[PDB]
Homo-oligomer: A and B are copies of this chain.
Amino acid sequence: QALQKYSTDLTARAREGKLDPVIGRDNEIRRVVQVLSRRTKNNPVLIGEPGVGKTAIVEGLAQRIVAGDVPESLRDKTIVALDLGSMVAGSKYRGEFEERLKAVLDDIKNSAGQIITFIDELHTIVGAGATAMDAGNMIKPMLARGELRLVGATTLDEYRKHIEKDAALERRFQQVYVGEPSVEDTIGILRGLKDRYEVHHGVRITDSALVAAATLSDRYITARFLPDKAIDLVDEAASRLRMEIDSRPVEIDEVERLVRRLEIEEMALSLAKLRSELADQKEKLAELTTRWQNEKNAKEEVGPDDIADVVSAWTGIPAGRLLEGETAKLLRMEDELGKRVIGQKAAVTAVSDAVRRSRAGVSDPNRPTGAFMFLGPTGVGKTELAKALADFLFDDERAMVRIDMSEYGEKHTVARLIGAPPGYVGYEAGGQLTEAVRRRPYTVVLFDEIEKAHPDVFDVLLQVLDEGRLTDGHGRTVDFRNTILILTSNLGSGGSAEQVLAAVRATFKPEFINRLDDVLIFEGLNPEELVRIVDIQLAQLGKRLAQRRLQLQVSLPAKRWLAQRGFDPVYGARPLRRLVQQAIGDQLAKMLLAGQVHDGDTVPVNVSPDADSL
């Protein structure tokens, strides 16, 4: 009766059908039965990386014992799962634990070879009674005679920390190595569990969802292992579907809550403004509502789309079908990007191309998406281009990772981006390039001024470009599969179009230029196109003055006089920004803090033959 209170049963639960059907892995089952039926030293320890199924094998053995495919030897054995937490429960007195354990063991030894014990997580055997080691190695003279069959299941790396420390126990246990499967059998494992999820959520799951979630989840979520990493998408997609069985969908709830919020704020202020955005949002919410009704007049199952929406929600790399939500943006993308960068169109199209080939799935699945270096003279706008394609992909400007290779003058500064080896000073922080990516892995990475780095940083990114893995000091292999790398330079500012390709080849190696994508050349500027830069700069400086709601009224002769002063094409578009302040800035500053330009109406600017007044 001592086994009754301190231990449950599995075979009695298996006869009632409370275990999920265990599919595949006949080799490990036959190996466990082969180990388990020998004469002496008969207890397997299932060992593998966590998640691959090491309790499901024991439940499959329970299913086979209840069914009856076992041989004559293991005939009707009734596996009993023990505990180690409900035995050290209250034992503050001196001999209170030890007679308890010895009573359990005498009950196991008493019966006629029936009971096969099953301790899960057996690394807790070692530190049992903290008195001077007495407990845990009490069962050591009993395992050698083969008296309790003791099937266990511990992980791989919690084994050489505890059990290999105490190697007198280590030779009692045999070992069964359970490695993960591949996709080709994980599809078959998924297809058999598609009954219990229909019960707990009364919905229907298409087979296309399973063959998608096995294939799609192995490129994106790389922190888990193959069986455990693919069920969760199916379950959470079923929950996504069951949430919307409430009378409305999601967008309508979102919009209702949003407009209620803006309503609240607005009425509390009683700002205009919001008044408009209210109305617009009320138009939208109206339209959708009507659409909803329409549809009703005319969903209840999951498909291969909602799996992709789960994977796009978590680890926020979007990986859907492009269901028209951004297709109008991805066709108006060269047009949108040419609102902040003017000209250089032959290398704007070449960057738009490396995204539009990759949203539609044509590019190589295991290689970084965009890994290319663009260069030219100084002032063209090659840094402003990089901060303007992260502007509409992310609605951000600091979500990119700007790391700067003008500080890496010496050789040994490489370690600040890969972290210290194990045993030295900083071994908690890891890398700095690694740990910035491993959370939110979709950002854009810069490398400003690749010139002035020492020629040893180049041999670290030689495996970043081609096969997108990188290993930090710990051993977490982070992967740069779907980021966008950017390299800048200044080599050969105004030399030629062929001298510039003679200094690039002379500084790098014939194994590093080949790793790259298309190496681009930014051109110079033109005196005709300089006016449109002045337009954007004055628009920016007019937007800045919303602190005190002034604006500017600018005449065309001023707007072209500031363009005709954009001289010296050694410097590019940079000195025009200084010219804007030396004409308009300090003049308006002196005009401002002497009173008299209190906020409200703007000022007019006007030329006066050499300078310009206000």
Q: Residues of A with Cβ closer than 8 Å to B? A: 156, 160-161, 164, 177, 179, 182, 378-379, 395-396, 402-404, 406-407, 409-416, 418-430, 432, 435, 439-440, 448-449, 452, 456, 459-460, 462-463, 469, 471, 473-475, 490, 493, 510-511, 514
Contacts and interface: CB of A to CB of B under 8 A. Distances in A.
A459 B411 contact: no
Given A426-B423, A427-B425, A510 B418 contact: no
Given A378-B511, A402-B469, A424-B425, 4 more contacts: A160-B430, A177-B439, A177-B440, A413-B421
A409 B410 CA distance: 12
Q: Chain A's interface: helix, strand, loop or mixed, by majority?
A: loop
Contact of A407 (B156, B161, B418, B422): B418
Contacts of A462: 406, 449
A161 B428 contact: yes
A-B interface, 3 closest residue pairs, ranked by CB to CB distance from nearest:
A422-B426, A420-B423, A416-B421
A423 B422 contact: no
A426 to B, nearest CB: 4
Contact of A420 (B378, B422, B452, B456): B422
B463 A406 contact: yes
A432 B177 contact: no
A471 B432 contact: yes
Nearest to A410: B412
A425 B424 CA distance: 7
Contacts of A459: 406, 409, 449, 452
Contacts of A514: 378-379
B463 A448 contact: yes
A427 B448 CA distance: 25
Contacts of A463: 404, 406, 448
A416 B379 CA distance: 31
Nearest to A515: B378
Which of A164, A182, A378, A430 has the largest number of chain B CB atoms within 10 A? A378
Nearest to A414: B409
B490 A456 contact: no
Contacts of A425: 422-424, 427
Contacts of A411: 409-410
Contacts of A378: 510-511, 514
Nearest to A438: B160
Contacts of A419: 422
Contacts of A426: 422-423, 427
Contacts of A510: 378, 493
A465 to B, nearest CB: 12
Given A422-B426, A426-B427, A427-B426, A406 B460 contact: yes
Contacts of A493: 510-511
Contacts of A460: 406-407
Nearest to A452: B459
A419 B429 CA distance: 16
Contacts of A402: 469
5 contacts: A156-B439, A423-B424, A424-B425, A449-B462, A490-B511
Nearest to A164: B474
Contacts of A473: 416
Contacts of A440: 177, 179
B456 A404 contact: no
Which of A420, A448, A469, A493 has the largest number of chain B CB atoms within 10 A? A420
A412 B424 contact: yes
A421 B402 CA distance: 18
B421 A412 contact: yes
B415 A423 contact: yes
Contacts of A409: 411, 414, 456, 459
A423 B424 CA distance: 6
Contacts of A490: 511
A463 B456 CA distance: 22
Nearest to A425: B427
Contacts of A475: 429, 432
A452 B396 CA distance: 38
Contacts of A435: 160
A479 B480 CA distance: 28
A478 to B, nearest CB: 12
Nearest to A161: B428
A422 B428 contact: no
Contacts of A456: 409, 452
Contacts of A403: 471
Contacts of A452: 456, 459
Contacts of A413: 421
Contacts of A471: 403-404, 432
Which of A161, A396, A404 has the largest number of chain B CB atoms within 10 A? A404
Contacts of A161: 428
Nearest to A378: B511
A48 to B, nearest CB: 9
Nearest to A420: B423
A410 B463 CA distance: 18
Contacts of A420: 422-423
